[PDB]
Amino acid sequence: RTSIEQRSNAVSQVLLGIFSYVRWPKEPAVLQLCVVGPTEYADGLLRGMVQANGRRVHAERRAVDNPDLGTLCNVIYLGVVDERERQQVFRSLAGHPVLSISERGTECSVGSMFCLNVGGPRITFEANLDSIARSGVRVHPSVLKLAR
Amino acid sequence: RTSIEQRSNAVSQVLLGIFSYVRWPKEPAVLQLCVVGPTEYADGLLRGMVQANGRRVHAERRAVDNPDLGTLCNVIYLGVVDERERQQVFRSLAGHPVLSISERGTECSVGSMFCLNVGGPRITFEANLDSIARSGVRVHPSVLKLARRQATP
Numbered sequence: 001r002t003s004i005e006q007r008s009n010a011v012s013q014v015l016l017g018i019f020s021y022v023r024w025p026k027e028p029a030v031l032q033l034c035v036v037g038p039t040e041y042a043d044g045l046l047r048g049m050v051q052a053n054g055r056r057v058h059a060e061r062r063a064v065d066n067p068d069l070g071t072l073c074n075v076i077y078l079g080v081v082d083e084r085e086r087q088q089v090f091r092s093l094a095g096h097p098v099l100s101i102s103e104r105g106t107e108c109s110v111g112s113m114f115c116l117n118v119g120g121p122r123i124t125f126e127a128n129l130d131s132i133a134r135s136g137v138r139v140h141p142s143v144l145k146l147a148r
Numbered sequence: 149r150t151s152i153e154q155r156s157n158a159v160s161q162v163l164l165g166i167f168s169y170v171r172w173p174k175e176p177a178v179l180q181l182c183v184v185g186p187t188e189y190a191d192g193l194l195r196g197m198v199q200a201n202g203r204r205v206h207a208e209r210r211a212v213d214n215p216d217l218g219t220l221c222n223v224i225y226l227g228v229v230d231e232r233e234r235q236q237v238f239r240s241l242a243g244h245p246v247l248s249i250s251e252r253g254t255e256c257s258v259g260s261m262f263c264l265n266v267g268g269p270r271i272t273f274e275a276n277l278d279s280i281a282r283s284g285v286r287v288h289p290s291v292l293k294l295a296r297r298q299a300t301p
């Protein structure tokens with residue numbers, strides 16, 4: 001088991017944790033996760049995951065310029081994108097109840113609601129409170145206790 | 149246009165095509181492939197592949213800063229990394245017989261032997277003679293027959 005694999009599984013676990021604080025307006029029977037753009041640590045997600053409640057999380061890769069990310073995805077896990085691609089993605093998510101989490105995120109000021117920092121002894125993440133507030137999903141504030 | 153999983157599967161086949169033109173000085177029983185950095189089209193590779201002669205390609209992701217990439221990997225599928233990360237990677241491969249292929253076309257300028265262009269109707273690729281020469285492996289020039297046909301409607 002490589003360190004990328006260990007981390008990938010941790011990313012899976014961190015994500016499940018975050019998911020538990022999120023509520024969608026209409027809760028789907030199967031939670032759709034979309035991995036968008038190049039990622040290092042999404043392989044665990046892509047094998048599939050199940051929430052504590054029993055809801056299955058189905059994950060697949062979708063393209064940065066898929067115009068239907070907002071209706072096809074309940075959760076976005078965002079990899080390497082440039083500014084024009086990131087804007088494209090979030091224009092698709094606009095007005096839809098979509099949880100967004102980015103794999104990197106030096107700053108986490110614009111774009112995703114939560115930004116993982118995966119390198120390092122443990123995975124940490126930051127919260128973008130403004131993204132959270134414009135996101136369409138409800139987020140229990142206790143999740144911030146799990147952030148950095 | 150094409151789907152992501154379609155492209156990934158096609159990436160597998162282009163890579164197998166490229167492998168077929170390459171020879172390692174001491175041919176291993178199992179070809180070791182390392183996916184390094186963030187990738188969008190490597191999920192197929194990571195299932196493992198088999199070459200026409202029946203040799204298996206074992207694939208796994210490895211860290212950019214793994215100093216033993218050159219020793220642990222026969223092939224590098226290079227993802228989308230930064231300047232410093234890339235330099236680390238190729239410094240690690242120096243003096244080791246390693247085939248390097250990049251997911252994006254930008255990397256032929258900076259160390260990768262082959263560089264894929266995945267968007268479009270077919271997957272095309274370009275190559276760099278400098279990086280090939282210093283690679284420690286032999287590449288038959290016929291490899292560009294595959295690139296040319298891929299680039300042809």
Ligand SMILES: Cc1ncc(CO)c(CO)c1O
Pocket residue numbers: 275277280281286287288289291292
């Ligand atoms: C594409 C290409 N790759 C490799 C070589 C020699 O390794 C040649 C011939 O020098 C070539 O044309």
